[PDB]
Amino acid sequence: MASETPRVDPTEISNVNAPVFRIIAQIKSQPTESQLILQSPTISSKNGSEVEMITLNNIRVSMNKTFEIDSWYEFVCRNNDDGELGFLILDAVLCKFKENEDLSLNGVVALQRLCKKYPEIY
Amino acid sequence: KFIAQRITIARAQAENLGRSEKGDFFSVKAAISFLKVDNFAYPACSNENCNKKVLEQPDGTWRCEKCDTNNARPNWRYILTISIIDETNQLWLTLFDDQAKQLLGVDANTLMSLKEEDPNEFTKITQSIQMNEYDFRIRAREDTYNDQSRIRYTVANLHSLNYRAEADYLADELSKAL
DNA sequence: TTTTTTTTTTTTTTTTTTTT
């Protein structure tokens, strides 16, 4: 909305308690529609940082927001402060780049890092 | 292995110079601001490598001075330039027949016949093509006509649609900053 | 892995939507 909605890493759930944020990562298909797998690697492989995947529980909320395979989506979500639950799915934006081409997540990760160290600029 | 690092137009005039007399163009990533409505395409004869500008004798058909011929189709060549803006400076770029023909994807004869045409689609193409982002290879030279001399720039090439390489390159530059 | 032959030396882009 009109408030601050920075892009944060899905592993920052411990740092910030129940914010409203957007996530850009890879969407995987679960056996059911009530769960979600977020694949978010970081830069190089053997540099000491590996693929960071976070599993969420979709339940019955946002049925029409189901994500297409291999497609990208901007995740507008709010973290749950109770327990044993991931980020509550609220809104999703259609995200794709071009045809016969792809995008490396590294440029996104360096994004989500900078806005953490520099709150003045988004 | 692609061209990534470059400089700006503000850094083009003086950066730790010189560089006394020597350089050949360089790469620029700059947005397009406005397209001039005057001096678009000058007419000439239809032939390969025409260096002459035809004039009008008291005839009504275009006449070439060096090569005597009757011109059925006054083939137009692009004299049109553009006004561009970059991260710092606002500059002007002169485009040739291939550069201006590649910019809007329309030839010079079809553009001239499009302007004089009854529909208004000429201004629709002019306003639709303007305000975009483009990549050029620009060189600087100083020419003098009579009393007035200044440095002007030209476009030696056009490149666009590159996105992923710039984002990943800047990401690598951010990772190498530590 | 990049080396001129097609002019003249200026150039105006959006000029009207807005409180007491």
Residues of chain B with CATH 2.20.25: 43-78
Residue A19 in domain: yes
Give the residue on A whose Cα is nearest the Cα of B176: A110
Residue A24 in domain: yes
Q: What's chain B look like in SS3?
A: CCCCCCCCCHHHHCCCCCCCCCCCCCEEEEEEEEECCCCCEEECCCCCCCCCCCEECCCCCEECCCCCCCCCCCCEEECCEEEEECCCCEEEEECCHHHHHHHHCCCHHHHHHHHCCCCCHHHHHHHHHCCCEEEEEEEEEEEECCCCEEEEEEEEEEECCCCHHHHHHHHHHHHCCC
CATH class of B43-78: mainly beta
User: How far is Cα A112 from Cα B117, in angstroms, rounded to an integer?
Assistant: 52
- Residue that is written with structure tokens 């997540």 in the block: A105
Residue A120 in domain: no
User: How far is Cα B120 from Cα A80, in angstroms, rounded to an integer?
Assistant: 57
Distance from the Cα of A85 to chain B's closest Cα (Å) equals 33
Q: Is the CA virtual torsion B46, B49, B53, B58 positive or negative?
A: negative
Residues 134-153 of B with CB under 7 A from strand C: 137, 141, 143-146, 148, 150, 152
User: Domain of A60?
Assistant: 10-115
CATH class of B10-40+79-175: mainly beta
Q: Is A69 within 8 Å of A43 (Cβ atoms)? A: no
What's the number of domains chain A is made of? 1
Category of B49 on φ-ψ map: left (φ > 0), alpha (ψ -120 to 50) or beta: left
Record the tokens describing residue A31, joined without a space.
Answer: 């056996």
**A106 at B interface, C-beta within 8 A:** yes
Q: What's the CATH number where A100 sits?
A: 2.40.50
Q: Is the CA virtual torsion B116, B118, B124, B129 positive or negative?
A: negative
Residues 58-117 of B with CB under 7 A from strand C: 77, 79, 81, 83, 92, 94, 96-97
Residue A122 in domain: no
Residues of B with CB under 8 A from a CB of A: 161, 163-164, 167-168, 170-172, 174-175
Contacts B172 to A, Cβ<8 Å: 106
Q: Which amino acid does the sequence have at B98?
A: D
Longest dimension (CA), chain B: 73
Residue A55 in domain: yes
Resolution for this experimental structure (Å): 4.7
- Residue that is written with structure tokens 């989500």 in the block: A112
Residue A89: helix, strand or coil by DSSP? strand
| CB count in 10 Å sphere of residue B62 | 21
Residues of chain B with CATH 2.40.50.140: 10-40+79-175
